[PDB]
Amino acid sequence: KTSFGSLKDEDRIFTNLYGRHDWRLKGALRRGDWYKTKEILLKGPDWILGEMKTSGLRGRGGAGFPTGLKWSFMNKPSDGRPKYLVVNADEGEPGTCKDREIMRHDPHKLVEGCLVGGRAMGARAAYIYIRGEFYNEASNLQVAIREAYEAGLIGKNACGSDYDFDVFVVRGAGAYICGEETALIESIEGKQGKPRLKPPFPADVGVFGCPTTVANVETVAVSPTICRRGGTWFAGFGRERNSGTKLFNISGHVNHPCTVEEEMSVPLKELIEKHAGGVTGGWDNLLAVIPGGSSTPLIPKSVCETVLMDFDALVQAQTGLGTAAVIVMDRSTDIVKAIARLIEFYKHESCGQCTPCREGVDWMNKVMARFVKGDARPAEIDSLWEISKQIEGHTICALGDGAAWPVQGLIRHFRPELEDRMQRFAQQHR
Amino acid sequence: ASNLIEVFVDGQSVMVEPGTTVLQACEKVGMQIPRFCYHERLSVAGNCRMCLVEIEKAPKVVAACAMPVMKGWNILTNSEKSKKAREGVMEFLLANHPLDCPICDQGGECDLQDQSMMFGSDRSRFLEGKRAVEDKNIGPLVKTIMTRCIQCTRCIRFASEIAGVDDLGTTGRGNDMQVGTYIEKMFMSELSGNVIDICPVGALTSKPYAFTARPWETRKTESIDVMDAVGSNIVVSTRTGEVMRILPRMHEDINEEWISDKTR
Amino acid sequence: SGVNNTKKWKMEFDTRERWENPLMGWASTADPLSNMVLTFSAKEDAIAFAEKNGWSYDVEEKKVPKPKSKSYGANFSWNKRTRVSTK
Amino acid sequence: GALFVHRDTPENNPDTPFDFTPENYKRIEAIVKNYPEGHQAAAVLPVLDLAQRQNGWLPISAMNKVAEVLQVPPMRVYEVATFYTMYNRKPVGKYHIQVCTTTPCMLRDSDSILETLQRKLGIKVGETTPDKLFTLIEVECLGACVNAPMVQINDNYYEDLTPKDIEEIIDELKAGKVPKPGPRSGRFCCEPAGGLTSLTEPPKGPGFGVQAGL
Amino acid sequence: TDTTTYKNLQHHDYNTYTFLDLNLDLSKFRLPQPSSGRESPR
């Protein structure tokens, strides 16, 4: 294909994204979940791993790492230790609600994906680390897991396939850094939500010191539909190496902010003006878009004209596809105030373990507050760029990179706005 | 090369055991990687990020204290990327470090000062206001001025692993993460002045030794301890014919790097 | 933690009497070789210097730190006691 | 405004009467059985959350009781409690309103929601009404950004808020009823306003699009 | 087969003990947990 978009509802995976049908076991069975999953488990781990590899599904977390390879890191004989699958149900990234929606509306998809992935790597248990603020979603997931346990899909015979699997749900207590892989592993282990260094990787030493794989809710939930419908269909959707179907969370200055399920490689303009109802005031009123959540930088309207929703397309646009969170800001937006609010969020949510992220993100927050006030001089823009470059790549996890990137994007694109603010402040104060 | 792997430090070849870290291979060659949180007798923490080095044919700098060498790695230690990483990390430490050097017990004994002069920049761009953290009262031996703390978790790791008390830790998050005890508790055990030794900054200093002299003044006389039958090797720090201080000596067969509170 | 001061051999002298000055309380000495510290690149060089100068010497062998087995993954063990409880 | 130190006060000394109910002890036993043997220290967060749910806030006696129950160091318990944000280490009101103020909620004008809440309750952010009924704080992203602006009261999300809507929500809470969660703009959840742009045709059902050989 | 009514209303009448009550209910459905061979890491 060449033009991507206009996804069909008969091809959409999350058929009950919008909560219009029953989310219970009977509703999931009527929608097609838990179908031939016994046959999938009897087909076994190599077949499922090959199916995900040929599907070409990438990480929905924002890392973008190939799911088939990542899950195939655990295809090893046991060394006397159990092996674990962990589901990142944190979803603390701003602009993002897709994990929340599919947890509260198709939880049996998540449970079936937990079973399928745990069989794919070889595992006894899937721990779902859910956000602590999602109390209704967590209770909803527990009701679904209870239904699965009573139906015999999980526990002591996984859908009658001679496989012992157990799905637990563990709640967080309000930390965005607990959405990280290793920090989430530590949070399950009962310490603080501080990420641990790599190596050792979680595929070797992870939760409780066992081999484990942390995967996103969207990835886990689309795993069994990928297995049922084949990897060829999922690879057919989307462009080359950016294949399949994505949940886009459009918010901000749009007429109808919403979560939608759309094919990959859709144009950003097509996605916004098809599902969000367009920018408030129009595409001419549109100023900037953050296309992958707060960790990815911003892009202006000029490159928003003809940009796609690929990992590779956004990297070529000097950005990334993170959690597919499309935050739209029109001409009425205070762009420096929005970016400084994001940096303040990163200051509040940094775990403080490692020096570059801790001190540099606090420093960036102070400099961005002064930038919003206009209380600086244009050399401080280059100083802030160098500070962000010192933070990026020198930290333990990628929160430092995800906090340095919005400042980089704002300095790269909206530098005359910053200079105008500083000049206006200098005029009206002297 | 029996059970050994070949690596390179600045192009110089060296045999190392598998599991050897980049820092250990570098010190086998004979070069000391900068550090703040790594201690060879504590567990690996990897938080201060001072030990970032550039491996050849690798884009991201790695932490030398934690990353083990794989095979044939050329560790560029004095490269431009390594110097830039050290300068950035030193800048981030000294951004919020307090201007307390004249009133601090780490006069010439400061790793932060010495590594600043050896690897960091010579000036600052920090135009903001620094943070301040209220002090603790963990006992009559260890005086705490916790504004100077750089959060390297050395004291926490020592208390957890060697003292075995599990009394210290980090409370909070972000820039407001404070090392200490949440409650008003006294860190009063044997082997409790070793946090004064291993704290690189002057956050944990000695209260009897407070404000008494300076390390350049103190002459170092190497002696043996008689307060027990271990016979721990010590340095008596003497100034002007006065015994000022007792420090441990390295002896791997008797007392390693630590001495008891009685002898200290 | 720096080790650049433990590379070269040194020869010093036995400590003699330092007393208190009656006028100002300063440290007074009667020996000239109080601050005499000599630096050598080798133990045999220092021993040769002491023997040619006729001083009786006491030589101490250099204590190099033993190579430690450091592993970051030991902090997160399944079954061993090396699992740390905090960071 | 929170301080990560403990000051010995008569309301928060380590002698305030806290102990789990027998039902809470059964729940603690269920959590410990949920985690693997030898790693019962991993059950600190659910047990501390259960203590908070029983007591309201978390006193230092509750922290020490959790440490005693799980046989873990109290300093580790203090580490967890001070690290994680939604553990209340000081007493809060009966209704704990958290207004999200992160960038998409700011774009959808959560500031007006915050100012109307401040004017209605007569309090600033981070403080408590004098009748110990409402605590109002600012928070970061709460995971519902397409429904901005939104608040969280106890365990319930109130979404798509207007100043009028949050006024009736406060009136309902003062009257003592359940204001019911969800968006207040007429849409049930994250669906686009003014009709569905997708998922209009009903789902196909089992045995649709199944590859051969499965 | 209705598609015009929200069907998550079961989350409206949830108390503050729903999650832990469900956890206690599912405590009988699980596998025996693995052991590290020691009672704690001490």
Ligand SMILES: Cc1cc2nc3c(=O)[nH]c(=O)nc-3n(C[C@H](O)[C@H](O)[C@H](O)COP(=O)(O)O)c2cc1C
């Ligand atoms: C600060 C930070 C926060 C993150 N938050 C999340 C999150 O809420 N959910 C998530 O799935 N991944 C999150 N990630 C990315 C995880 O590293 C990644 O999702 C995880 O390794 C699973 O990979 P996957 O995308 O292949 O599923 C976060 C990463 C960082 C650095």
Ligand code: SF4
């Ligand atoms: S990068 Fe930030 S969030 Fe990650 S370990 Fe370092 S301080 Fe913590």
Ligand code: SF4
């Ligand atoms: S710890 Fe070092 S850098 Fe800090 S005030 Fe003391 S002497 Fe100065």
Ligand code: SF4
């Ligand atoms: S008090 Fe000293 S040893 Fe402890 S974390 Fe701070 S700087 Fe490190």
Ligand code: FES
């Ligand atoms: S010495 Fe390696 S990060 Fe601190």
Ligand code: FES
């Ligand atoms: S930014 Fe407010 S809920 Fe996400």
Ligand SMILES: [K+]
């Ligand atoms: K010190």
